[PDB]
Every structure is written in structure tokens, then in C-alpha cells.
């Protein structure tokens, strides 16, 4: 159609421009086309090195989206710059592969033992694998609910405790260590309802093992306390957004600050000490927002991605500082950087935990990008 065509046209012309400015806007930009689109992406904690090599190796947990052929759980190794047949391999390879029944919606490793990877299937089961066992039939099948989902959150502080969101208006909680397994199957320690609609995302508080937050299409943010008795009584409910809320992430350097992304094209800043007053609303995205992640290195900065094909990076510290018109355009002072290297909807992204400022983002066209904005943008 005409609109599709016009759209596709602007996307290319803009991309054209982007690529030309690459050396000016970035310090690192790596593009790579997977054989299949990945809906998930998360960096693994470890870093591998060799003496004499000008690079270190990092790894990502990716997935495949084949609405046909066989799907797999992937582990990709990426070579990253250091302080400075039989030929040298490419900077990106797929070290591990694991047959997975259906697309991989999410895939997160367990903080306590990253050999453990939890998965979100297009089914209603939640799978668990140990990529030390398959070196495929999951090592654990988590019962819990009737619908598909994406929300997935491992609890630090409590080995094994996993949370999940679902299109069936509920949240499940399991103890992966679950005594017995009755045929690789662990039922569900608790099911939190309290949500009028589809639950988009879920996330554990980072310090208090009994707290966690949920987010759903009912336009609300709910804070829960595992200790409470009513599996329908969220200890708190917040009218967070105009549209449906798609995610929430806790600030790594705080025990109160939180963030949420909505279809209302907005990212809301929240403080647990007073969920009655929204601290701020980051605006600029032109379509739905599905991912929001805080920098693992700076308490003041977070990023968001969505359907508008843009990855935004914000800086709380610049909220409110005055800016010069015709500069006061392009966006508010809180918008530190805009990543326009993706040519399709960004499905998910992850901040590298060892290399401050490196981000990996997977797009729907099955493109993967490892990038780092130019130092000057966040320095001087």
C-alpha cells in the first residue's frame, strides 16, 4: 500500500543518512544479520580474554523466531575492542544452540547460576534449561497458566524464585529448586491475579526478596509483597499510564526509584516512597514502548525501545535544565542520545554489564546491533 511504501521510503533515506554519520555519532557500531529474528537479547556476566589479543569476548543470550522451521535458544559470542579455512573468525558467532519448541519470546539467565536459562514459549508453559545439560526437551516445565507471555524475572536474593507475566491476566511464581518435579514439571507456588487485563511485564525489587512489580494492559502498575496472604491484593496499585503499560525496571543504584514504559509513547519515573506523585515523564518516542532498561553503570541514565524503531537514552540529571531553542528541539534535555540504526521495530535490547555504554539491540528484520555512542555525547 501507499502508506507502507512511503514509510519504507523514509526509513531507507533516513538510514542512508544515519550510516554516513556513524563515525561522528559512535565509537563502536557492529551490525549483524541473524538467520532468524530474535525477540529477546541479554548479555551474560562473564568476559573472556587472551593475552596478546586486542579484544575480549562477551556473550549474549538470543532466540529465534521462525513461524515455520525449527527454533533455537542461542548463545552468541561477540568480540569487543580492548584498551587499544582456518582464518580468524568473525567478530560474532553462535557458540551454543538449543532446539526450542516455538519462538523464544524472552530468555533470561538465573543471576545465581547463569548456566540456568528460563524461557517464554508461545505456548503457556515456561521452560528452564541448563546449557551444561544439553552440551532438546527442557530440564523443567513450569505449569502455571493458560496463555502466552513475555514477562520474565529471576529473583536475586532468592535462588530459584522466578516470576512470569501472561496474556491470561495473571502472574505465576515458582521455586525452580522446587522439591521434586513430577516429570520435569513444577506446578506454581502462587498465582497473582489482581489484574483486569493482560500482564505485560514483571520484575523483582532488587533488594527486598519479597517485593516485585507487575505491569499490564489495565494501564496500571502494581507492587506486590510475597508475604501478603491475598494473592489478589497487590500491596499497591498505580494509575501509571494513559495506554497499556508494557514494562518496568528498577534502578540498580536505588531501593525506591522505578521506571515504566507505555503504549502512550511515554516512560514514567516512579519513587516507591510516594507512588502518588509521578516524578517525571520522558516523551519523544513516536509509538509504543516495550523495553526500558537502566544503565548498569550510571544511576542517572536509562534507555527505552519500541515500535518507532528508535532506542532512546535518557539522563535524569538533565531533567529541567534549560536549553537553547533550535536545540530545544530534537527533544528535551533529558534525551541524551537517539539510536536510529534500526530499520524495523526493536524487539529487545541489553546494556553490556562490563563495557559501560555498549548496548546490543535486536530488530524484527532479524538484525542485531552492538553499539556505543561517541564518548563526547556523555562527557566533557
Swiss-Prot record:
WD-type repeats, residues: 99-132, 144-175, 194-225, 240-271, 284-315, 341-372
Localization per Swiss-Prot or TrEMBL: Nucleus
Pfam families recorded: CAF1C_H4-bd, WD40
Molecular-function annotations in GO: histone binding; histone deacetylase binding; protein homodimerization activity; transcription cis-regulatory region binding
GO BP annotations, alphabetical order: chromatin organization; chromatin remodeling; DNA replication-dependent chromatin assembly; eggshell chorion gene amplification; facultative heterochromatin formation; heterochromatin formation; negative regulation of DNA-templated transcription; negative regulation of transcription by RNA polymerase II
Residues annotated with Phosphoserine modification: 1
Record-level GO cellular component terms: CAF-1 complex; ESC/E(Z) complex; histone methyltransferase complex; Myb complex; nucleus; NuRD complex; NURF complex; polytene chromosome
Keywords assigned: Chromatin regulator, Nucleus, Phosphoprotein, Repeat, Repressor, Transcription, Transcription regulation, WD repeat
Role played: Core histone-binding subunit that may target chromatin assembly factors, chromatin remodeling factors and histone deacetylases to their histone substrates in a manner that is regulated by nucleosomal DNA. Component of several complexes which regulate chromatin metabolism.
Assembly behavior: Probably binds directly to helix 1 of the histone fold of histone H4, a region that is not accessible when H4 is in chromatin. Self associates. Associates with chromatin. Component of the CAF-1 complex, composed of Caf1-55, Caf1-105 and Caf1-180; within the CAF-1 complex, Caf1-180 interacts directly with both Caf1-55 and Caf1-105. Component of the NuRD complex, composed of at least Caf1-55, Mi-2, MTA1-like and HDAC1/Rpd3. Within the NuRD complex, Caf1-55 may interact directly with Mi-2, MTA1-like and HDAC1/Rpd3.
Name this protein carries in UniProt: Chromatin assembly factor 1 p55 subunit
Highest classification ranks of the organism: Eukaryota, Metazoa, Ecdysozoa, Arthropoda, Hexapoda
Amino acid at each position: 500500500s501507499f502508506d507502507d511504501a512511503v514509510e519504507e521510503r523514509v526509513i531507507n533515506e533516513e538510514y542512508k543518512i544515519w550510516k554516513k554519520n556513524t563515525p561522528f555519532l559512535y565509537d563502536l557500531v557492529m551490525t549483524h544479520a541473524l538467520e532468524w529474528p530474535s525477540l529477546t537479547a541479554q548479555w551474560l556476566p562473564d568476559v573472556t580474554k587472551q593475552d596478546g589479543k586486542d579484544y575480549s569476548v562477551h556473550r549474549l543470550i538470543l532466540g529465534t523466531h521462525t513461524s515455520d522451521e525449527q527454533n533455537h535458544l542461542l548463545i552468541a559470542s561477540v568480540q569487543l575492542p580492548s584498551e587499544d579455512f582456518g582464518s580468524v573468525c568473525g567478530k560474532i558467532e553462535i557458540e551454543i544452540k538449543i532446539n526450542h519448541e516455538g519462538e523464544v519470546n524472552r530468555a533470561r539467565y538465573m543471576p545465581q547460576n547463569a548456566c540456568v536459562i528460563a524461557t517464554k514459549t508461545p505456548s503457556s508453559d515456561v521452560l528452564v534449561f541448563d546449557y551444561t545439560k544439553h552440551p532438546c526437551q527442557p530440564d523443567l516445565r513450569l505449569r502455571g497458566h493458560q496463555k502466552e507471555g513475555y514477562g520474565l524475572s529471576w529473583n536475586p536474593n532468592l535462588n530459584g524464585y522466578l516470576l512470569s507475566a501472561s496474556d491470561d491476566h495473571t502472574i505465576c511464581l515458582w521455586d525452580i529448586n522446587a522439591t521434586p518435579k513430577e516429570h520435569r514439571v513444577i506446578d506454581a507456588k502462587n498465582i497473582f491475579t489482581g489484574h483486569t487485563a493482560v500482564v505485560e511485564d514483571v520484575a523483582w525489587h532488587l533488594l527486598h526478596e519479597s517485593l516485585f512489580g507487575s505491569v499490564a494492559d489495565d494501564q496500571k502498575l502494581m507492587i506486590w509483597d510475597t508475604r501478603n496472604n491475598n494473592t489478589s491484593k497487590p500491596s499497591h496499585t498505580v494509575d501509571a499510564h494513559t495506554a497499556e503499560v508494557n514494562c518496568l525496571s528498577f534502578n540498580p543504584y536505588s531501593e525506591f526509584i522505578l521506571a515504566t514504559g507505555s503504549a502512550d509513547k511515554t516512560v514514567a519515573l516512579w519513587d516507591l516512597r510516594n507512588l502518588k506523585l509521578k516524578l517525571h515523564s520522558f516523551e519523544s518516542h513516536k509509538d509504543e514502548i516495550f523495553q526500558v532498561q537502566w544503565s548498569p553503570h550510571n544511576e542517572t541514565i536509562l534507555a527505552s525501545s519500541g515500535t518507532d524503531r528508535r532506542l532512546h537514552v535518557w539522563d535524569l540529571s538533565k531533567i529541567g535544565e534549560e536549553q537553547s531553542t533550535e536545540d530545544a528541539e530534537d527533544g528535551p534535555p533529558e534525551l541524551l542520545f537517539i539510536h536510529g540504526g534500526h530499520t524495523a521495530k526493536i524487539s529487545d535490547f541489553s546494556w553490556n554489564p562490563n563495557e559501560p555504554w555498549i548496548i546490543c539491540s535486536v530488530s524484527e528484520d532479524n538484525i542485531m546491533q552492538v553499539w556505543q555512542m561517541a564518548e563526547n555525547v556523555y562527557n566533557d
